[PDB]
Paper text:
Sirtuins are NAD+-dependent protein lysine deacylases implicated in metabolic regulation and aging-related dysfunctions. A cleft between these subdomains accommodates NAD+ and recognizes the acylated substrate polypeptide with low sequence selectivity, and binding of these substrates is accompanied by Sirt1 closure movements. Tat binds to the sirtuin catalytic core and inhibits Sirt1, Sirt2, and Sirt3 with comparable potencies.
We, thus, used Sirt3 as a model system for structural analysis of the sirtuin/Tat interaction and resolved the crystal structure of a Sirt3/Tat-37–59 complex at 1.95 Å resolution. The structure was refined to Rcryst/Rfree values of 22.7/27.6% and revealed clear electron density for part of the peptide ligand. Best defined in the inhibitory peptide is a small fragment, residues 48–52, which belongs to the Tat basic domain, while residues 44–47 and 53–57 are primarily defined via their peptide backbone. The complete basic motif assumes an extended conformation, terminated by Pro58. The sirtuin-bound Tat conformation also resembles the conformation of this Tat region in NMR structures of the apo forms of wt-Tat and Tat-Cys−, indicating that the appropriate conformation for sirtuin binding is intrinsically preferred and this Tat region, thus, “primed” for sirtuin binding. While the N-terminus binds at a positively charged sirtuin surface patch, the C-terminal basic motif with its positive charges occupies a strongly negatively charged sirtuin pocket. Although it is not acetylated, inhibitory Tat Lys50 is positioned in the sirtuin substrate lysine pocket.
Numbering used by the authors:
A (entry chain C): 44 to 57
B (entry chain A): 122 to 395
Amino acid sequence: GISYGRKKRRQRRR
Amino acid sequence: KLSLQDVAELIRARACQRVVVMVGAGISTPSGIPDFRSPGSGLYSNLQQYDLPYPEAIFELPFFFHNPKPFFTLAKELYPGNYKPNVTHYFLRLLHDKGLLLRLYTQNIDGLERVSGIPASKLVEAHGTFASATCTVCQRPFPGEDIRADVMADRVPRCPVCTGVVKPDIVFFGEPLPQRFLLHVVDFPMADLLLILGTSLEVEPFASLTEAVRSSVPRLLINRDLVGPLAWHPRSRDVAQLGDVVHGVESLVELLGWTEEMRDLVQRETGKLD
Ligand SMILES: [Zn+2]
């Protein structure tokens, strides 16, 4: 895995 | 630019027989599983008594240790026995029975993929499961059955050894995904078709798996919207069947010629769960 980390929330919408 | 029937023809001729699937909450709403962010359900009413600043706090560790009762209210609702898989789960079940499923990656914690009959070896429950729990203090593991009585009685389960809160192995925000998620480094280079069903891809690192398939691999999205890296980084073989997830699935099943076989599977699987 290439820098696969924590469970996190995304952006770029609404 | 491929179509939905083009993807169906590739599956019928076994041109794509190592399918990886990514699913979200959109495939389990047909089962009646309520969205706890909107009013209406008894789950929403049972969560109103707790002063949640936002619905996502139920999956945050700081708020969990502040008050774990909201989470265990959802756990009581989602514990196995309350809901059954729907037609979208059994389409993925039929895909496995016909030897076409490489792996199923799910963000859901309802455990309906296992209930549908898909073996655990074919499944990656990327956001956790209620099948096991862990004490937040001493790390002692527990089967999910050992806390079921407390959960059903609205009691926060405690560790018999150190009296710490016992938390189901659900992945909260800030926590790394289970070690089984690392199967993507092997599965996604091997996939010849990527199916994305009922998810908005708002959660990482699950969302970025869509770009882990190779450049020639088609990516079929069955969702109400075009979302995630499929909108900013689309590919030449991306297929987007926008609309209701169930309608998109039963359209694909019909284009595959599996409609009659799928219904016979559902009635025998649904009835056995009684
Ligand atoms: Zn303990």
